[PDB]
Amino acid sequence: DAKGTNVNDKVTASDFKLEKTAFDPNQSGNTFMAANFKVTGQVKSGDYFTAKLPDSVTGNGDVDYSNSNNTMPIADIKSTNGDVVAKATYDILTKTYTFVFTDYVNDKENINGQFSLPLFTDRAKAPKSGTYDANINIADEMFDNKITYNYSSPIAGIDKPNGANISSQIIGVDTASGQNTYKQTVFVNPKQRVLGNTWVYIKGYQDKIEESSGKVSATDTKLRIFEVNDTSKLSDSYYADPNDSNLKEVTGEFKDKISYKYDNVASINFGDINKTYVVLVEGHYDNTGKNLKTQVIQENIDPATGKDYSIFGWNNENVVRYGGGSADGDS
Amino acid sequence: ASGSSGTGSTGNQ
Ligand SMILES: [Mg+2]
Ligand SMILES: [Mg+2]
Description:
The complex is a heterodimer. By secondary structure, chain A is mostly beta strands. Helices cover 0% and strands 48% of the residues of chain A. Chain A contains no helices and 25 strands. Chain A has strands spanning 11-18, 22-23, 31-39, 48-52, 57-58, 71-78, 84-91, 96-101, 109-121, 130-133, 136-138, 141-143, 146-149, 166-173, 181-188, 195-203, 214-215, 222-228, 247-249, 258-259, 265-273, 277-285, 293-301, 310-321, 324-330. Chain A is elongated. By secondary structure, chain B is mainly beta. Chain B has one strand spanning 4-9. In chain B, 62% of the residues are buried. At the A-B interface, β6, β9, β14 and β24 of A face β1 of B. The structure holds magnesium ion (2 copies). One magnesium ion binds next to loops of chain A. Chain A: This is Clumping factor B. Chain A: Cell surface-associated protein implicated in virulence by promoting bacterial attachment to both alpha- and beta-chains of human fibrinogen and inducing the formation of bacterial clumps. Chain A: Belongs to the serine-aspartate repeat-containing protein (SDr) family. Chain A: Residues 1-331 are annotated as: Ligand binding A region. Chain A: It is found in: Secreted, Cell wall.
């Protein structure tokens, strides 16, 4: 039963198709890979074959498995009767899918089947809009593709020269481990305007507390705040590396400026600013099973006049996609 | 819905 011999040399994949080759990961866009596969000869329980993803795509997308040993279960490959033909997992770090045959295969031959698995952007490795190679290995054979990411720009806000402007994206949600963490990137003033008396609010909900599982609080939330040297260098994908020299962490300058006084919201007092800041949120959600929905808000004035107030909000929520597959062999 | 939205897979769990 345990993972045994690699039988890529016995498995041929075919009729490979992506569901689509262009989408917008900032509006829940994703694709699927679909392929047929067939086994030449016989395999035995524990034999396995693999598929390997390149830098531009991931199998997990905005779902985070770092608290589950970087491993995600995948849907079982099942026969018509419903019997499990292969169990499958995916390694987040090595981007490798492994399909391990069960004892169903022991008395069979010329097993063949098919799968459809959801594929997502890699926000870190594909940080800008554009076209990327997405050459995918299945069973030691390459299937070449191009994928185009047209990210909805994170640079959004009120249409005045001193207008409030802010955006965010939840780029990691831990659904597996039980810890219920989430990771959110917030871009404050991505327009890089000159703003007076700036306040930012990070909420664990949108309009209705009871309709989100998010919990923002001093004990559930940690914030890191970075001043951005060059705004042009920020991702379109909302990925932001805390170690990138373009970001200067200034968290220690905000110890008197962050308040969890109000319900399910953190407020941050930015004051008079003229740069973009990144806020990396490490949060948690509760066990109500409600959707995780959030909103960030920024308000400010015109610093030269003291007036021309404005306020802008930005909602986040994520969606889940599923895979499926089947296989049968002759006796 | 407004703002932006993400997407991922839980591996059918
Ligand atoms: Mg092969
Ligand atoms: Mg509170």
